[PDB]
Protein backbone atom coordinates (compact mmCIF):
# COMPACT_ATOMS: atom_id res chain seq x y z
CA UNK A 1 0.00 0.00 0.00
CA UNK A 2 1.83 3.07 -1.29
CA UNK A 3 -0.94 5.39 -0.02
CA UNK A 4 -1.02 3.88 3.49
CA UNK A 5 -0.68 7.39 4.95
CA UNK A 6 -4.39 7.96 4.29
CA UNK A 7 -6.50 7.91 7.45
CA UNK A 8 -8.62 5.15 5.88
CA UNK A 9 -5.48 3.02 5.55
CA UNK A 10 -4.67 3.71 9.21
CA UNK A 11 -8.16 2.59 10.22
CA UNK A 12 -7.85 -0.55 8.10
CA UNK A 13 -4.49 -1.38 9.68
CA UNK A 14 -5.85 -0.79 13.19
CA UNK A 15 -8.88 -3.00 12.55
CA UNK A 16 -6.73 -5.76 11.06
CA UNK A 17 -4.24 -5.68 13.95
CA UNK A 18 -6.94 -5.49 16.65
CA UNK A 19 -7.56 -9.25 16.25
CA UNK A 20 -3.95 -10.47 16.20
CA UNK A 21 -3.31 -13.75 18.04
CA UNK A 22 -0.07 -15.36 19.15
CA UNK A 23 1.55 -18.11 17.11
CA UNK A 24 2.37 -19.98 20.33
CA UNK A 25 -1.32 -20.75 20.81
CA UNK A 26 -1.49 -21.98 17.21
CA UNK A 27 1.45 -24.28 17.89
CA UNK A 28 -0.28 -25.56 21.03
CA UNK A 29 -3.49 -26.09 19.04
CA UNK A 30 -1.45 -28.01 16.41
CA UNK A 31 -2.33 -25.51 13.67
CA UNK A 32 1.34 -25.27 12.64
CA UNK A 33 4.65 -26.82 13.61
CA UNK A 34 7.40 -25.15 15.62
CA UNK A 35 9.14 -23.79 12.51
CA UNK A 36 5.88 -22.41 11.09
CA UNK A 37 4.94 -20.85 14.43
CA UNK A 38 8.39 -19.24 14.70
CA UNK A 39 8.07 -17.88 11.16
CA UNK A 40 4.64 -16.43 11.94
CA UNK A 41 5.97 -14.85 15.14
CA UNK A 42 8.90 -13.33 13.23
CA UNK A 43 6.56 -11.95 10.57
CA UNK A 44 4.38 -10.40 13.29
CA UNK A 45 7.40 -8.89 15.05
CA UNK A 46 8.52 -7.46 11.70
CA UNK A 47 5.20 -5.96 10.61
CA UNK A 48 4.21 -4.34 13.93
CA UNK A 49 6.79 -5.55 16.48
CA UNK A 50 16.12 -10.33 11.14
CA UNK A 51 12.34 -9.99 11.25
CA UNK A 52 10.08 -10.99 8.36
CA UNK A 53 11.88 -11.98 5.16
CA UNK A 54 11.71 -15.77 5.10
CA UNK A 55 8.83 -15.39 7.57
CA UNK A 56 5.23 -14.40 6.81
CA UNK A 57 5.12 -17.06 4.09
CA UNK A 58 4.42 -19.79 6.67
CA UNK A 59 2.12 -17.28 8.38
CA UNK A 60 0.10 -17.02 5.15
CA UNK A 61 0.11 -20.81 4.84
CA UNK A 62 -1.22 -21.17 8.39
CA UNK A 63 -3.86 -18.49 7.81
CA UNK A 64 -4.95 -20.44 4.72
CA UNK A 65 -6.08 -23.26 7.03
CA UNK A 66 -6.68 -21.24 10.20
CA UNK A 67 -9.92 -19.27 10.01
CA UNK A 68 -9.82 -16.93 13.02
CA UNK A 69 -7.57 -14.66 15.10
CA UNK A 70 -4.58 -13.18 13.22
CA UNK A 71 -5.00 -15.91 10.61
CA UNK A 72 -8.27 -14.25 9.57
CA UNK A 73 -6.79 -10.95 8.34
CA UNK A 74 -3.03 -11.14 8.95
CA UNK A 75 -2.29 -10.37 5.29
CA UNK A 76 -4.52 -7.29 5.40
CA UNK A 77 -2.88 -6.07 8.61
CA UNK A 78 0.61 -6.51 7.14
CA UNK A 79 -0.36 -4.77 3.89
CA UNK A 80 -2.03 -1.81 5.62
CA UNK A 81 1.25 -1.02 7.39
CA UNK A 82 3.86 1.14 5.70
CA UNK A 83 6.85 -0.35 3.88
CA UNK A 84 9.14 0.93 6.65
CA UNK A 85 8.22 -2.15 8.74
CA UNK A 86 10.80 -4.52 7.24
CA UNK A 87 9.26 -3.89 3.80
CA UNK A 88 6.24 -5.93 4.89
CA UNK A 89 3.80 -6.13 1.99
CA UNK A 90 6.04 -4.01 -0.22
CA UNK A 91 8.73 -6.70 -0.29
CA UNK A 92 6.11 -9.44 0.16
CA UNK A 93 4.49 -8.59 -3.18
CA UNK A 94 7.85 -8.83 -4.97
CA UNK A 95 8.64 -12.11 -3.19
CA UNK A 96 5.28 -13.55 -4.26
CA UNK A 97 5.93 -12.40 -7.82
CA UNK A 98 9.27 -14.22 -7.70
CA UNK A 99 7.29 -17.35 -6.70
CA UNK A 100 4.20 -17.45 -8.93
CA UNK A 101 3.30 -20.97 -7.75
CA UNK A 102 1.74 -19.63 -4.53
CA UNK A 103 0.94 -16.23 -6.07
CA UNK A 104 -2.71 -17.17 -6.61
CA UNK A 105 -2.83 -18.45 -3.03
CA UNK A 106 -1.47 -15.09 -1.89
CA UNK A 107 -4.12 -13.40 -4.03
CA UNK A 108 -6.64 -15.67 -2.30
CA UNK A 109 -5.13 -14.94 1.12
CA UNK A 110 -6.82 -11.54 1.28
CA UNK A 111 -10.55 -10.87 0.92
CA UNK A 112 -11.70 -13.17 3.71
CA UNK A 113 -13.65 -12.93 6.94
CA UNK A 114 -15.38 -9.69 7.86
CA UNK A 115 -14.97 -6.33 6.11
CA UNK A 116 -11.74 -5.66 8.04
CA UNK A 117 -10.04 -7.97 5.52
CA UNK A 118 -12.54 -7.64 2.66
CA UNK A 119 -11.86 -3.92 2.26
CA UNK A 120 -8.12 -4.46 2.77
CA UNK A 121 -8.14 -7.12 0.04
CA UNK A 122 -7.77 -4.39 -2.57
CA UNK A 123 -4.79 -3.19 -0.51
CA UNK A 124 -3.66 -6.72 0.45
CA UNK A 125 -3.43 -8.84 -2.71
CA UNK A 126 -2.42 -5.76 -4.73
CA UNK A 127 -0.80 -3.85 -1.87
CA UNK A 128 2.13 -3.20 -4.22
CA UNK A 129 -0.36 -1.82 -6.77
CA UNK A 130 0.63 -1.85 -10.45
CA UNK A 131 4.19 -0.79 -9.62
CA UNK A 132 7.20 -3.14 -9.32
CA UNK A 133 5.62 -5.63 -11.76
CA UNK A 134 4.27 -7.77 -8.92
CA UNK A 135 0.77 -7.94 -10.41
CA UNK A 136 -0.58 -8.49 -13.92
CA UNK A 137 -3.61 -7.70 -16.06
CA UNK A 138 -5.11 -11.16 -15.52
CA UNK A 139 -4.86 -10.77 -11.74
CA UNK A 140 -6.71 -7.43 -11.83
CA UNK A 141 -9.36 -8.84 -14.17
CA UNK A 142 -9.94 -11.81 -11.86
CA UNK A 143 -10.01 -9.63 -8.73
CA UNK A 144 -12.55 -7.28 -10.34
CA UNK A 145 -15.18 -10.01 -9.83
CA UNK A 146 -14.83 -9.99 -6.03
CA UNK A 147 -17.96 -8.65 -4.34
CA UNK A 148 -16.05 -7.46 -1.26
CA UNK A 149 -14.65 -4.51 -3.21
CA UNK A 150 -18.16 -3.54 -4.35
CA UNK A 151 -19.53 -3.88 -0.82
CA UNK A 152 -16.74 -1.69 0.57
CA UNK A 153 -16.56 1.03 -2.08
CA UNK A 154 -20.34 1.35 -2.54
CA UNK A 155 -21.23 1.12 1.17
CA UNK A 156 -23.55 4.10 1.70
CA UNK A 157 -23.50 3.75 5.49
CA UNK A 158 -19.78 2.90 5.72
CA UNK A 159 -18.48 6.26 4.54
CA UNK A 160 -14.90 5.55 5.64
CA UNK A 161 -14.84 2.13 3.97
CA UNK A 162 -16.31 3.57 0.76
CA UNK A 163 -13.74 6.38 0.72
CA UNK A 164 -10.88 3.94 1.33
CA UNK A 165 -12.06 1.61 -1.44
CA UNK A 166 -12.52 4.48 -3.89
CA UNK A 167 -9.06 5.83 -3.06
CA UNK A 168 -7.49 2.40 -3.57
CA UNK A 169 -9.30 2.01 -6.90
CA UNK A 170 -8.13 5.45 -8.03
CA UNK A 171 -4.55 4.65 -7.03
CA UNK A 172 -4.74 1.31 -8.88
CA UNK A 173 -5.11 3.19 -12.21
CA UNK A 174 -1.30 3.53 -12.58
CA UNK A 175 -1.07 0.74 -15.17
CA UNK A 176 -3.31 0.73 -18.29
CA UNK A 177 -4.37 -2.86 -17.59
CA UNK A 178 -5.40 -1.91 -14.05
CA UNK A 179 -7.24 1.06 -15.56
CA UNK A 180 -9.11 -1.28 -17.92
CA UNK A 181 -10.06 -3.54 -15.00
CA UNK A 182 -11.24 -0.48 -13.06
CA UNK A 183 -13.35 0.61 -16.04
CA UNK A 184 -14.85 -2.89 -16.31
CA UNK A 185 -15.77 -2.72 -12.62
CA UNK A 186 -17.20 0.79 -13.07
CA UNK A 187 -19.41 -0.42 -15.92
CA UNK A 188 -21.40 -2.23 -13.21
CA UNK A 189 -20.62 0.04 -10.22
CA UNK A 190 -22.03 3.14 -11.99
CA UNK A 191 -24.87 3.56 -9.42
CA UNK A 192 -22.58 3.96 -6.40
CA UNK A 193 -20.08 6.11 -8.29
CA UNK A 194 -22.80 8.48 -9.51
CA UNK A 195 -24.49 8.59 -6.10
CA UNK A 196 -21.19 9.59 -4.47
CA UNK A 197 -21.03 12.74 -6.60
CA UNK A 198 -24.77 13.33 -6.20
CA UNK A 199 -24.34 13.37 -2.42
CA UNK A 200 -21.25 15.55 -2.84
CA UNK A 201 -23.53 18.04 -4.63
CA UNK A 202 -24.65 19.29 -1.20
CA UNK A 203 -14.57 14.70 7.00
CA UNK A 204 -14.88 11.40 5.13
CA UNK A 205 -17.41 12.86 2.69
CA UNK A 206 -14.91 15.13 0.94
CA UNK A 207 -12.36 12.30 0.70
CA UNK A 208 -14.97 9.90 -0.70
CA UNK A 209 -16.11 12.48 -3.27
CA UNK A 210 -12.51 13.14 -4.30
CA UNK A 211 -11.86 9.41 -4.67
CA UNK A 212 -15.00 9.01 -6.79
CA UNK A 213 -13.96 11.96 -8.96
CA UNK A 214 -10.48 10.47 -9.39
CA UNK A 215 -11.95 7.11 -10.40
CA UNK A 216 -14.35 8.78 -12.85
CA UNK A 217 -11.52 10.79 -14.40
CA UNK A 218 -9.25 7.74 -14.65
CA UNK A 219 -11.98 5.70 -16.35
CA UNK A 220 -12.92 8.65 -18.59
CA UNK A 221 -9.32 9.25 -19.72
CA UNK A 222 -10.01 6.62 -22.39
CA UNK A 223 -12.24 8.20 -25.08
CA UNK A 224 -14.07 4.92 -25.71
CA UNK A 225 -15.11 4.62 -22.07
CA UNK A 226 -16.48 8.18 -22.00
CA UNK A 227 -18.35 7.69 -25.27
CA UNK A 228 -19.92 4.46 -24.00
CA UNK A 229 -20.83 6.04 -20.66
CA UNK A 230 -22.50 8.98 -22.42
CA UNK A 231 -25.10 6.48 -23.66
CA UNK A 232 -25.88 5.18 -20.15
CA UNK A 233 -24.83 7.97 -17.76
CA UNK A 234 -25.49 11.08 -19.84
CA UNK A 235 -27.18 12.81 -16.90
CA UNK A 236 -24.09 12.01 -14.83
CA UNK A 237 -22.14 14.25 -17.22
CA UNK A 238 -23.92 17.29 -15.77
CA UNK A 239 -24.26 15.72 -12.32
CA UNK A 240 -20.47 15.72 -11.98
CA UNK A 241 -20.37 19.38 -13.04
CA UNK A 242 -23.02 20.25 -10.45
CA UNK A 243 -21.09 18.35 -7.77
CA UNK A 244 -17.94 20.28 -8.67
CA UNK A 245 -19.84 23.59 -8.61
CA UNK A 246 -21.18 22.81 -5.13
CA UNK A 247 -17.86 21.31 -4.04
CA UNK A 248 -15.52 23.94 -2.62
CA UNK A 249 -12.35 21.82 -2.46
CA UNK A 250 -9.89 23.06 -5.09
CA UNK A 251 -8.49 19.61 -5.91
CA UNK A 252 -11.93 17.96 -6.07
CA UNK A 253 -13.25 20.72 -8.34
CA UNK A 254 -10.17 20.41 -10.55
CA UNK A 255 -10.67 16.65 -10.83
CA UNK A 256 -14.36 17.05 -11.66
CA UNK A 257 -13.67 19.69 -14.32
CA UNK A 258 -10.92 17.52 -15.80
CA UNK A 259 -13.29 14.54 -15.98
CA UNK A 260 -15.97 16.70 -17.62
CA UNK A 261 -13.47 17.99 -20.18
CA UNK A 262 -12.26 14.45 -20.87
CA UNK A 263 -15.87 13.44 -21.55
CA UNK A 264 -15.89 16.25 -24.13
CA UNK A 265 -12.38 15.48 -25.40
CA UNK A 266 -12.06 15.30 -29.18
CA UNK A 267 -10.88 11.70 -28.85
CA UNK A 268 -14.24 10.67 -27.38
CA UNK A 269 -16.45 9.45 -30.20
CA UNK A 270 -19.17 11.95 -31.13
CA UNK A 271 -17.43 14.63 -29.08
CA UNK A 272 -19.18 17.56 -30.77
CA UNK A 273 -22.72 16.20 -30.43
CA UNK A 274 -22.10 15.04 -26.86
CA UNK A 275 -20.72 18.46 -25.89
CA UNK A 276 -23.68 20.21 -27.52
CA UNK A 277 -26.18 17.98 -25.73
CA UNK A 278 -24.42 18.49 -22.39
CA UNK A 279 -24.40 22.27 -22.84
CA UNK A 280 -28.06 22.34 -23.88
CA UNK A 281 -29.39 20.04 -21.15
CA UNK A 282 -27.14 20.24 -18.09
CA UNK A 283 -26.60 24.01 -18.31
CA UNK A 284 -22.88 23.30 -18.60
CA UNK A 285 -22.47 26.56 -20.54
CA UNK A 286 -24.01 28.83 -17.85
CA UNK A 287 -22.11 26.81 -15.24
CA UNK A 288 -18.86 27.39 -17.14
CA UNK A 289 -19.69 31.09 -17.42
CA UNK A 290 -20.20 31.23 -13.65
CA UNK A 291 -16.91 29.38 -13.11
CA UNK A 292 -15.15 31.93 -15.32
CA UNK A 293 -16.77 34.67 -13.25
CA UNK A 294 -15.84 32.78 -10.08
CA UNK A 295 -12.24 32.71 -8.84
CA UNK A 296 -10.15 29.94 -7.30
CA UNK A 297 -6.53 29.51 -6.23
CA UNK A 298 -6.12 26.14 -8.00
CA UNK A 299 -4.21 26.96 -11.18
CA UNK A 300 -4.77 23.46 -12.57
CA UNK A 301 -8.45 23.66 -11.62
CA UNK A 302 -8.65 27.11 -13.22
CA UNK A 303 -7.18 25.79 -16.47
CA UNK A 304 -9.52 22.79 -16.44
CA UNK A 305 -12.53 25.04 -15.86
CA UNK A 306 -11.43 27.35 -18.68
CA UNK A 307 -11.08 24.39 -21.04
CA UNK A 308 -14.54 23.18 -20.02
CA UNK A 309 -15.91 26.67 -20.67
CA UNK A 310 -14.35 26.72 -24.14
CA UNK A 311 -15.85 23.29 -24.84
CA UNK A 312 -19.26 24.49 -23.64
CA UNK A 313 -19.08 27.61 -25.82
CA UNK A 314 -18.16 25.52 -28.87
CA UNK A 315 -21.02 23.12 -28.10
CA UNK A 316 -23.55 25.94 -27.67
CA UNK A 317 -22.44 27.70 -30.86
CA UNK A 318 -24.48 25.01 -32.66
CA UNK A 319 -27.08 24.18 -30.00
CA UNK A 320 -30.87 23.97 -30.20
CA UNK A 321 -33.74 22.98 -27.92
CA UNK A 322 -34.46 20.06 -30.28
CA UNK A 323 -31.61 18.15 -28.62
CA UNK A 324 -33.21 18.76 -25.21
CA UNK A 325 -36.55 17.57 -26.60
CA UNK A 326 -34.92 14.40 -27.94
CA UNK A 327 -33.24 13.75 -24.60
CA UNK A 328 -36.51 14.27 -22.73
CA UNK A 329 -38.29 11.88 -25.09
CA UNK A 330 -35.51 9.38 -24.40
CA UNK A 331 -36.06 9.80 -20.64
CA UNK A 332 -39.88 9.68 -20.58
CA UNK A 333 -39.86 9.62 -16.76
CA UNK A 334 -40.29 13.31 -15.90
CA UNK A 335 -43.15 15.67 -15.07
CA UNK A 336 -42.43 18.60 -17.40
CA UNK A 337 -40.43 19.14 -20.58
CA UNK A 338 -38.64 22.11 -22.19
CA UNK A 339 -41.30 22.61 -24.90
CA UNK A 340 -43.90 23.43 -22.22
CA UNK A 341 -42.01 26.67 -21.46
CA UNK A 342 -43.88 28.69 -24.09
CA UNK A 343 -45.56 28.58 -27.49
CA UNK A 344 -42.43 29.50 -29.44
CA UNK A 345 -40.48 26.27 -29.83
CA UNK A 346 -43.59 24.07 -29.78
CA UNK A 347 -44.78 25.89 -32.90
CA UNK A 348 -42.18 23.82 -34.75
CA UNK A 349 -41.92 20.97 -32.23
CA UNK A 350 -45.49 19.89 -33.04
CA UNK A 351 -44.18 18.74 -36.43
CA UNK A 352 -40.71 17.82 -35.15
CA UNK A 353 -41.36 14.65 -33.15
CA UNK A 354 -43.92 13.52 -35.74
CA UNK A 355 -41.53 14.06 -38.68
CA UNK A 356 -44.51 15.72 -40.42
CA UNK A 357 -46.22 12.30 -40.54
CA UNK A 358 -46.04 10.94 -36.96
CA UNK A 359 -43.46 8.43 -38.23
CA UNK A 360 -40.63 9.78 -36.07
CA UNK A 361 -43.12 10.14 -33.19
CA UNK A 362 -43.64 6.37 -32.92
CA UNK A 363 -40.70 6.50 -30.52
CA UNK A 364 -42.77 9.05 -28.63
CA UNK A 365 -45.61 6.51 -28.77
CA UNK A 366 -43.40 3.86 -27.15
CA UNK A 367 -42.26 6.40 -24.55
CA UNK A 368 -45.89 7.22 -23.76
CA UNK A 369 -46.70 3.50 -23.51
CA UNK A 370 -43.87 3.05 -21.00
CA UNK A 371 -45.04 6.13 -19.09
CA UNK A 372 -48.57 4.68 -19.01
CA UNK A 373 -47.25 1.34 -17.76
CA UNK A 374 -45.53 3.30 -14.99
CA UNK A 375 -48.64 5.45 -14.56
CA UNK A 376 -50.62 2.67 -12.89
CA UNK A 377 -48.20 3.02 -9.97
CA UNK A 378 -48.07 5.95 -7.55
CA UNK A 379 -44.32 6.62 -7.78
CA UNK A 380 -43.39 10.29 -8.08
CA UNK A 381 -41.59 9.61 -11.35
CA UNK A 382 -44.56 7.45 -12.36
CA UNK A 383 -47.07 10.27 -11.86
CA UNK A 384 -44.71 12.79 -13.47
CA UNK A 385 -44.40 10.59 -16.56
CA UNK A 386 -48.16 9.95 -16.65
CA UNK A 387 -48.74 13.70 -16.73
CA UNK A 388 -45.91 14.57 -19.13
CA UNK A 389 -46.61 11.94 -21.79
CA UNK A 390 -50.32 12.80 -21.86
CA UNK A 391 -49.57 16.53 -22.02
CA UNK A 392 -47.17 16.03 -24.93
CA UNK A 393 -49.73 13.82 -26.69
CA UNK A 394 -52.39 16.51 -26.27
CA UNK A 395 -50.01 19.19 -27.55
CA UNK A 396 -49.10 17.13 -30.62
CA UNK A 397 -52.69 16.10 -31.38
CA UNK A 398 -53.91 19.71 -31.21
CA UNK A 399 -52.26 20.30 -34.61
CA UNK A 400 -52.55 18.12 -37.73
CA UNK A 401 -54.97 15.56 -36.21
CA UNK A 402 -54.08 12.94 -38.85
CA UNK A 403 -51.41 11.39 -36.63
CA UNK A 404 -54.03 11.25 -33.86
CA UNK A 405 -55.54 8.32 -35.75
CA UNK A 406 -52.21 6.50 -35.43
CA UNK A 407 -52.36 7.30 -31.72
CA UNK A 408 -56.04 6.35 -31.62
CA UNK A 409 -55.38 3.02 -33.33
CA UNK A 410 -52.37 2.51 -31.03
CA UNK A 411 -54.62 2.74 -27.97
CA UNK A 412 -54.69 6.52 -27.65
CA UNK A 413 -58.32 6.56 -26.54
CA UNK A 414 -57.74 3.61 -24.22
CA UNK A 415 -54.58 5.23 -22.85
CA UNK A 416 -56.44 8.49 -22.18
CA UNK A 417 -59.26 6.61 -20.44
CA UNK A 418 -56.80 4.63 -18.31
CA UNK A 419 -54.87 7.76 -17.33
CA UNK A 420 -58.09 9.27 -15.94
CA UNK A 421 -59.50 5.90 -14.86
CA UNK A 422 -58.78 6.25 -11.13
CA UNK A 423 -56.01 6.54 -8.54
CA UNK A 424 -54.33 9.29 -10.56
CA UNK A 425 -53.92 13.05 -10.18
CA UNK A 426 -51.56 14.23 -12.93
CA UNK A 427 -52.47 11.32 -15.23
CA UNK A 428 -56.09 12.47 -15.30
CA UNK A 429 -54.95 16.10 -15.28
CA UNK A 430 -53.34 15.45 -18.68
CA UNK A 431 -55.93 12.97 -19.99
CA UNK A 432 -58.42 15.83 -19.69
CA UNK A 433 -56.35 17.85 -22.16
CA UNK A 434 -55.85 14.79 -24.36
CA UNK A 435 -59.61 14.15 -24.58
CA UNK A 436 -60.43 17.87 -24.94
Amino acid sequence: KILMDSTHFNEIRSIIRSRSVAWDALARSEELSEIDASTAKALESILVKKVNGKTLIPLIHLLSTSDNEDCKKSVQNLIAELLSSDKYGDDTVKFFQEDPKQLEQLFDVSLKGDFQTVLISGFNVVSLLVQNGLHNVKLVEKLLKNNNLINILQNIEQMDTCYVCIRLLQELAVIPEYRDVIWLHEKKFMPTLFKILQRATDHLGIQLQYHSLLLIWLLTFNPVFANELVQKYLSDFLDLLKLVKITIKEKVSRLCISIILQCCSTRVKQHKKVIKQLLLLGNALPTVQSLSERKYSDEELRQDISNLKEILENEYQELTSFDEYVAELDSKLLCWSPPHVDNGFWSDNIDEFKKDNYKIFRQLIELLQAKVRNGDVNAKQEKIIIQVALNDITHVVELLPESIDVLDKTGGKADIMELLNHSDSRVKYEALKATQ
Partner: peptide, 24 residues
Protein backbone atom coordinates in the same frame (compact mmCIF):
# COMPACT_ATOMS: atom_id res chain seq x y z
CA UNK B 1 0.23 14.55 -12.12
CA UNK B 2 -1.92 11.92 -13.83
CA UNK B 3 -2.46 14.42 -16.66
CA UNK B 4 1.23 14.12 -17.52
CA UNK B 5 0.97 10.33 -17.22
CA UNK B 6 -1.79 10.28 -19.83
CA UNK B 7 -0.01 12.84 -22.02
CA UNK B 8 3.04 10.55 -22.09
CA UNK B 9 1.34 8.05 -24.38
CA UNK B 10 -1.06 10.66 -25.79
CA UNK B 11 2.00 12.26 -27.42
CA UNK B 12 4.61 9.51 -27.77
CA UNK B 13 2.29 7.07 -29.56
CA UNK B 14 -0.10 9.54 -31.21
CA UNK B 15 2.68 11.69 -32.67
CA UNK B 16 4.25 8.78 -34.56
CA UNK B 17 0.87 7.44 -35.70
CA UNK B 18 -0.36 10.78 -37.03
CA UNK B 19 2.93 12.23 -38.34
CA UNK B 20 5.30 9.30 -38.99
CA UNK B 21 3.36 6.24 -40.15
CA UNK B 22 1.07 8.29 -42.39
CA UNK B 23 4.17 9.47 -44.28
CA UNK B 24 4.77 5.87 -45.38
Amino acid sequence: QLKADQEYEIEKTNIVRNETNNID
